[PDB]
Amino acid sequence: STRKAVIGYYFIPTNQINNYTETDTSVVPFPVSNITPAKAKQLTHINFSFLDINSNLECAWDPATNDAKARDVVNRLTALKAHNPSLRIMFSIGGWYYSNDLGVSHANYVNAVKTPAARTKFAQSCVRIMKDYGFDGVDIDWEYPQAAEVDGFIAALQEIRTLLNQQTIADGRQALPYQLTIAGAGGAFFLSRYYSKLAQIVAPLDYINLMTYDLAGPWEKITNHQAALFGDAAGPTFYNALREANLGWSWEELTRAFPSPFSLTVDAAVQQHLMMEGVPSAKIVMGVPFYGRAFKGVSGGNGGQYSSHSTPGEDPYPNADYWLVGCDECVRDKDPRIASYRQLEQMLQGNYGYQRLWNDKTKTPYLYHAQNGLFVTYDDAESFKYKAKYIKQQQLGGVMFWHLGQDNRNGDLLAALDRYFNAADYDDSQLDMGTGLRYTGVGPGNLPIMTAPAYVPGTTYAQGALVSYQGYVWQTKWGYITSAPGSDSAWLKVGRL
Ligand X SMILES: CNC(=O)NC(=N)NCCC[C@H](NC(=O)C[N-][N+]#N)C(=O)N(Cc1ccccc1)Cc1ccccc1
Ligand Y SMILES: C=CCO/N=C/c1ccnc2ccccc12
Cite the active site residues: 143
Tell whether residue 52 is a contact of ligand Y (CB under 6 A): no
Least distance in angstroms from the C-beta of 478 to ligand X: 45
Nearer to ligand X, 159 or 214 (CB): 214
Distance CA 254, CA 270 (A): 17
Triad 357, 359, 360: Cα angle to 5°: 130
User: Pattern of binders to ligand X over 428-467, x per CB under 6 A?
Assistant: ----------------------------------------
Q: Binding site annotation covers 405?
A: no
Backbone angles phi, psi at 393, to 5 degrees: -60, -40
Q: Binding site annotation covers 213?
A: yes
Query: Which among ligand Y, ligand X, none contacts residue 183 (Cβ within 5 to 8 A by kind)?
Result: ligand X
Q: Binding site annotation covers 491?
A: no
Nearer to ligand Y, 317 or 455 (CB): 317
Least distance in angstroms from the C-beta of 6 to ligand X: 15
CA dihedral 87, 91, 96, 100 (to 10 degrees): -130
Tell whether residue 398 is a contact of ligand X (CB under 6 A): no
- Of 315, 321, 360, 432, the residue at the interface with ligand Y (CB under 6 A) is 315
Nearer to ligand X, 153 or 291 (CB): 291
Residue 141 contacts residue 49 (beta carbons within 8 Å): yes
Residue 143 contacts residue 100 (beta carbons within 8 Å): yes
- Of 135, 341, 386, 402, the residue at the interface with ligand X (CB under 6 A) is 402
Distance CA 229, CA 227 (A): 6
Residue span binding ligand Y (CB under 6 A) among the ranges 69-77, 81-89, 196-204, 212-220:
212-220
Residue span binding ligand Y (CB under 6 A) among the ranges 113-121, 216-224, 351-359, 470-478:
216-224
- Of 300, 313, 453, 479, the residue at the interface with ligand Y (CB under 6 A) is 313
Q: Which of residues 217-276 bind ligand Y (CB under 6 A)?
A: 217-219
Compute how many residues bind ligand Y; rule: CB under 6 A: 6
Least distance in angstroms from the C-beta of 51 to ligand X: 12
Q: Binding site annotation covers 211?
A: yes
Least distance in angstroms from the C-beta of 220 to ligand Y: 8
Q: Which of residues 262-321 bind ligand X (CB under 6 A)?
A: 291, 315
- Of 136, 139, 214, 380, the residue at the interface with ligand Y (CB under 6 A) is 214
Q: Binding site annotation covers 96?
A: yes
Least distance in angstroms from the C-beta of 40 to ligand X: 20
- Of 95, 336, 398, 441, the residue at the interface with ligand X (CB under 6 A) is 95
Q: Binding site annotation covers 335?
A: no
Least distance in angstroms from the C-beta of 257 to ligand X: 26
Tell whether residue 11 is a contact of ligand X (CB under 6 A): yes
User: Pattern of binders to ligand X over 216-255, x per CB under 6 A?
Assistant: -xx-------------------------------------
Nearer to ligand X, 232 or 335 (CB): 335
Q: Binding site annotation covers 341?
A: no
Q: Give the contacts of 493 (CB within 8 A, at least 6 positions apart).
A: 444, 447, 472, 473, 474, 485, 486
Q: Specify binding-site residues for chitin.
A: 67-68, 94-97, 144, 211-214, 402
Residue positions forming the annotated binding site: 67-68, 94-97, 144, 211-214, 402
Which residues contact ligand Y by CB under 6 A?
214, 217-219, 313, 315
Query: Could you list the residues that contact ligand X (CB under 6 A)?
Result: 9, 11, 95-97, 141, 143, 183, 211, 214, 217-218, 291, 315, 337-338, 402
